[PDB]
Amino acid sequence: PLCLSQQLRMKGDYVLGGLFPLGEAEEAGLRSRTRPSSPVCTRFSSNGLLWALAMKMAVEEINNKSDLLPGLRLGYDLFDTCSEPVVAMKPSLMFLAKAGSRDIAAYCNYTQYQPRVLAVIGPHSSELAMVTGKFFSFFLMPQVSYGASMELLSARETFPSFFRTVPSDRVQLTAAAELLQEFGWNWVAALGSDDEYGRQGLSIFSALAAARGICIAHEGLVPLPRADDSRLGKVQDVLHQVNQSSVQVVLLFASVHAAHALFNYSISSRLSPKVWVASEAWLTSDLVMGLPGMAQMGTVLGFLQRGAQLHEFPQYVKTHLALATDPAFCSALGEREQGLEEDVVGQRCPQCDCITLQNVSAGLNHHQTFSVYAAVYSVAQALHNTLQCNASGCPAQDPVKPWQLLENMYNLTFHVGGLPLRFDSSGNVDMEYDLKLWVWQGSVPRLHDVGRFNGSLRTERLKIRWHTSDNQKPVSRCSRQCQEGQVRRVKGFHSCCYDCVDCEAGSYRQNPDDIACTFCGQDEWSPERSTRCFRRRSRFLAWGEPAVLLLLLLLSLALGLVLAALGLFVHHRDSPLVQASGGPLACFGLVCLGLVCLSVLLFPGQPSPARCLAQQPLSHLPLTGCLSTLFLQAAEIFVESELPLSWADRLSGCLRGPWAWLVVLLAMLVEVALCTWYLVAFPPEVVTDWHMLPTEALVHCRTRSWVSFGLAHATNATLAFLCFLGTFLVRSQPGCYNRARGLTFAMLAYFITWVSFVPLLANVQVVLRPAVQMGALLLCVLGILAAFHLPRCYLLMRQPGLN
Amino acid sequence: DFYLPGDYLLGGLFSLHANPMCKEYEVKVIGYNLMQAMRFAVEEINNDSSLLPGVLLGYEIVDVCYISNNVQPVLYFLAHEDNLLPIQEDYSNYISRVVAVIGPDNSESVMTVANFLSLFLLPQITYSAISDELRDKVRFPALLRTTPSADHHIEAMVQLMLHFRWNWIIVLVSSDTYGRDNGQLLGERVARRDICIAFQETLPTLQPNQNMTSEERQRLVTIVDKLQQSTARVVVVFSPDLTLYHFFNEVLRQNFTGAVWIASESWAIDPVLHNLTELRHLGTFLGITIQSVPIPGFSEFREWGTCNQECDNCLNATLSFNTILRLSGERVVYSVYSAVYAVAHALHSLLGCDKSTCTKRVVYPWQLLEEIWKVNFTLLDHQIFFDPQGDVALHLEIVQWQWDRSQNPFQSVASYYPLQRQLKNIQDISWHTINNTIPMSMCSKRCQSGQKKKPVGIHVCCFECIDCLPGTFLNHTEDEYECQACPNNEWSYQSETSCFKRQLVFLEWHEAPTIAVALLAALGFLSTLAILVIFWRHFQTPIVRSAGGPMCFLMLTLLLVAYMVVPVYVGPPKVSTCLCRQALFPLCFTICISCIAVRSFQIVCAFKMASRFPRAYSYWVRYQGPYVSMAFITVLKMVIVVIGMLATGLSPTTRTDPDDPKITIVSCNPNYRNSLLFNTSLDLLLSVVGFSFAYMGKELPTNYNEAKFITLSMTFYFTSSVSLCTFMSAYSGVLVTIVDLLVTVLNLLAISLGYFGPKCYMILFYPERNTPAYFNSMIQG
């Protein structure tokens, strides 16, 4: 049976203390507490015994060493913690009982107290760290922990005797926050283990987010794998938030198990890859390195502790185990340690000690051993200084009390394996870190250095692959101090940062603070990103519109030609040809052209609803009268063309006099009648639309139905068509220009114009709709003269000349 | 005031001061109040004879000093009278000087003491600690508790929040473990209960003795300005009152009027904060405390006048705040009093006393733990029994903070039953609203009917309201989150979460325009029938025959079809009537126009063009060149019809009428406009070519007069086609089909009563033109 428990104590002169997990308490006693007895920890652990052997190596080194603690040897009180305060507190109470006794007094003062150990090599588990440190603080016994990292343990008002190595979670969290700051990663969602480790780290990182500037997005926790299994569901929700927050960087301060569950689910759910700012609890553990498919989950990168490994340790461990096999040395040390506390140590059984060298020869190069080793040297040096010892001996006047160390352990400088470590006021040494990546090449994530951390980061982004494409660094930024114009929706778990949205067209912002693009009335005009509503300008059928000006010029031309023709008609009254072209009925027609000018001229300018009512009907009126004159002429010509003889004579007699003017005035009456009718049915009115175009308010003569106007025009148009049928059939006069053909060009062109501009009018835009309408009448009336009266003038100013 | 001898003592750990010597710390009235509560409990237990005849109980209190003096108390406990505590593996044989300790109030100090006590398995009833860790028993076997956990407090808080409909909250939690733990608990409680935190941010600690350090000053300025910027006006705060004093001072200086501050136990009820009496201007303050039947005779006990075991001026502060304590009616005193009574009942059952005489058996601590884990007894009409996780069913209670000094500084609003996990009996609660209403606190106003809600920000509470467009209706019935389309005839408009209906419109027989055109077509068909009857009646004449002879009837015969088709235009535009109107009506129209066109073609040719190509036209007439030509025209139209069918959809389209959705034009074809243009452009071309040829041959024959009829027909059809074009270009939404029927009749009459009718007109008016000799002379000339 391997000789271990016998070696788990030594006499020395100023005995140290150890609180290590040389075992693992079975998961029954912890739940079954009905009798006051600590659970046994038969189950063996490897790293715990490695740490105990490291403490032993350090103590043997200092004892063997001459210049450090000359003449004074240090012992042990190796006691198990079993990673459980219930079973780890009895050894702690033992450490502070009395010199060579088993009773711990409760005197108000601790100055007169003389405990058994001089210091404690604090536990690993940080729950144990807190419980045992609370116990030790009052008695002021220097407790140096080798694995504790929770930041509260540095609170030197309730833990004044904690002197842990392995810097706290604070330092790695500051490194992570600094990395985010220098990589421009304001918008970060930080997760955490449900256990106290994760929550503590998350609180520290919230403080660091406030300080450095990065704005937290989602501050949740990832439940540990538990029998409830609702944990898994909860994870999804937490994971879902990471998807929803749109974050390419996530801080995972989870323990190894929590991160394992998180990443297993992330693979199983096909979660979008993102940067995973890791922690020392999972950044290298194989339980998260083995998961299939993990390589496709963004870049895992995190800060890992840097510190010389305790070399020449494997040889010592192998030699010590082998010598523990040797009966002679075991019996010798048993005889040396007789009747003393060599048995009360943990795992004191035979079998509890009977193991195989392979039972522990796995994590032989474990980074924690150094910490344990360092711890001993610390107290060694501390003791070496509190006795005021020097090279080659020292007076050692009186047994130094632990509070003497407490006084003379802060700001201590000790060299461990050539590393000059030094505690600070908070009691935690400051060791540097290195940014380990998780670069994948063959599904075996290799971790490599990017930059170091001496309290200030020294990264170099070039090395990180950054997954994605073209090794582009994932940008996860938050709109902070953004353009004032946009509306600002506050987001983030804290009020930090906000989303800025460009306002829409037609909606303005009352004040910068408000969080809505207010919508104002159509009277104003608001473009994109305008916190104000801008008044428009009126748009109408102004007299000054270029098209309106052209139409006015055309109306002036029409008036001129009408006046010329009617002057020729007032003069050439006796000439039979002028009369045969229509007589004073054609005088009515020419003045009707002038009057249709006087009628159509109401469109341009500022339109009034009354103008819309009274304009178009009186517009059709004079043109209707003149075209009725045209119809008289055409029907008379048609009747002449026909050959009934008696009917032709009767119609000529009837139509020469009374019927001509009677029909003219009847056409006038019909025009005004249908005008009143449509005005009752669909009277157009002036209306304003502000949404038709953004920057202007379109005030124009809206029409209830252009069909009504079409029919009002179609009255005279149908008269035109009737005369067109009457006149078109006429064959050219033998050896003379035909009279019917003048009327034929006239009405045929009139249709070609109005039948044509009704669709052109419909197609064109609303405000120019009256504009081209102007032209219609102009062109329309022009047509008549360009195809009815032009030959009449031609003759009149050439009739005397020809003969 | 700190000790009493006895047989079985009861250790106590009351926190007397806050913020070895510990009377230098700020005195806490509540500490001495709770001390006196436990003193009253033990005194009443000893006075009684039923509870424990004889077997005198004993007590002893050692100040814990909040967090400072925790270890020394317990170590003095569980130690022999000489103050030596041996270390043993098995403690079942240890006689601890105190059977069970009470007092640890702060959760952290409670854990600190409970670790050692679990070592010795000493019963420990914590009278006010709240953290949910103590619920766990693997960590703390002996940590019984007589105040509900923090989870119950948070559930009461969230149920109050729901009852007043505040889904938009803010959380402020101090930096200490208490604040972070309570904040996480509230976050997990509300993430599931429809309530979304506006933002949870940490509140830095500010001790009353602290000099309000700068960094903290601007940090708190940030806190308060973020608070008032936001829209959530229910601010739940988890922090010790010590920091709340400074926080409330600074925020009050900051003009943050509208706010409903929810308080946690830690400071839900406390004389220090109540005495400020200047918070009426910050709104309403709510908190949660624990309610129980008042101790019948404890105030009279109150008014009566180891390291740091004693206190200096606790009684002076208690006398100063006695008015508040009596009016406020301290209730944690019931917690500790019931804890002492539960320990007494456990000691009573364990001793197995027969209600008259007790056997003073030497009692071990763990034995009392086992016996106390199941006590089940009445106490002032409140049942005391511990659940398997170490907690009692003690009614919580919502406390409204009433400033008025009249009476009852703390007001009971809502009562929360833990066994039922429900908060009810919410009495009337006055607020800071000017109308005594329920203050609003919501992220976004609920969208009115007809608009979808699309989320804004990470939180699922609030959204932008958007009136989902016409044809889409807010599907609040199934999914209120996203609006859904409303297909088929159902049609919605802006807003209007309920759709409307679309009515398909086709050509009927009732519309006045429809009736008028139908009468017009009936008159035309009667005229056609009369023309046919006269033509058949006078086939002997060369006017009837030269129009086509028997073949002329065919035109008329085919003409009949169009009139028969005229109503076929009316009726549903289903596949059947559609195919009819698309296949045969064009057949008639085309043959009718083209036969007359060919008639004119050959008349003018025999007049003018035939002389140009005599041999060619003769060989053409050999097989009836004219009949050949319009036969080819019939063939070409058949080609057009089949091609249009191949490249065009027979089935109708219910195209929405732009005037209004309720009317939807059932057009017989998806693009019957351009399809009709493609079908009728050939008709227009043939008609215009025939008119041009007639105009070339305008020398109309005396008895044939072909021009005087054909030219009329062709010109008037050309004008009609242009009129149809103009009407389309205007595109009068409704009535397109009826006007199209008008036009179909229009060109039908064009041909019929523009060519054939005059033949009968001249036949009946005068028969001389029908004279064969005159006809032959006219042909020659």
Swiss-Prot record, chain A:
InterPro entries: ANF_lig-bd_rcpt, GPCR_3, GPCR_3_9-Cys_dom, GPCR_3_9-Cys_sf, GPCR_3_C, GPCR_3_Ca_sens_rcpt-rel, GPCR_3_CS, Peripla_BP_I. One of its GO terms (biological process) is sensory perception of umami taste. It comes from the Eukaryota. It is found in: Cell membrane. It is a multi-pass membrane protein. Putative taste receptor. TAS1R1/TAS1R3 responds to the umami taste stimulus (the taste of monosodium glutamate). TAS1R2/TAS1R3 recognizes diverse natural and synthetic sweeteners. TAS1R3 is essential for the recognition and response to the disaccharide trehalose. Sequence differences within and between species can significantly influence the selectivity and specificity of taste responses. Residues 515-524 are annotated as: Required for brazzein responsiveness. Disulfide bonds: none annotated. Changing A516 to T/S/E/V: Abolished the response to brazzein. CDD domains: 7tmC_TAS1R3, PBP1_taste_receptor. Residues 1-549, 604-618, 683-708, 763-768 are extracellular. Its main location: membrane. The gene is TAS1R3. This is Taste receptor type 1 member 3. Changing A516P: Receptor unresponsive to all sweeteners tested.
Swiss-Prot record, chain B:
It comes from the Eukaryota. The keyword Transmembrane applies. Glycans are attached at N47, N211, N255, N275, N316, N376, N435, N475. One of its GO terms (molecular function) is taste receptor activity. SUPFAM superfamilies: Periplasmic binding protein-like I. Residues 1-514, 572-583, 651-675, 730-732 are extracellular. Pfam families: 7tm_3, ANF_receptor, NCD3G. PROSITE patterns: G_PROTEIN_RECEP_F3_2, G_PROTEIN_RECEP_F3_4. Residues 536-550, 605-629, 697-708, 754-781 are cytoplasmic. The keyword Cell inner membrane does not apply. PANTHER family: CALCIUM-SENSING RECEPTOR-RELATED (PTHR24061), TASTE RECEPTOR TYPE 1 MEMBER 2 (PTHR24061:SF517). Keywords: Cell membrane, G-protein coupled receptor, Glycoprotein, Membrane, Receptor, Sensory transduction, Signal, Taste, Transducer, Transmembrane, Transmembrane helix. Belongs to the G-protein coupled receptor 3 family. TAS1R subfamily. Putative taste receptor. TAS1R2/TAS1R3 recognizes diverse natural and synthetic sweeteners. One of its GO terms (biological process) is G protein-coupled receptor signaling pathway. This is Taste receptor type 1 member 2. It is a multi-pass membrane protein. Forms heterodimers with TAS1R3. One of its GO terms (cellular component) is plasma membrane. It is found in: Cell membrane. CDD domains: 7tmC_TAS1R2 (cd15288), PBP1_taste_receptor (cd06363). The chain crosses the membrane at residues 515-535, 551-571, 584-604, 630-650, 676-696, 709-729, 733-753.
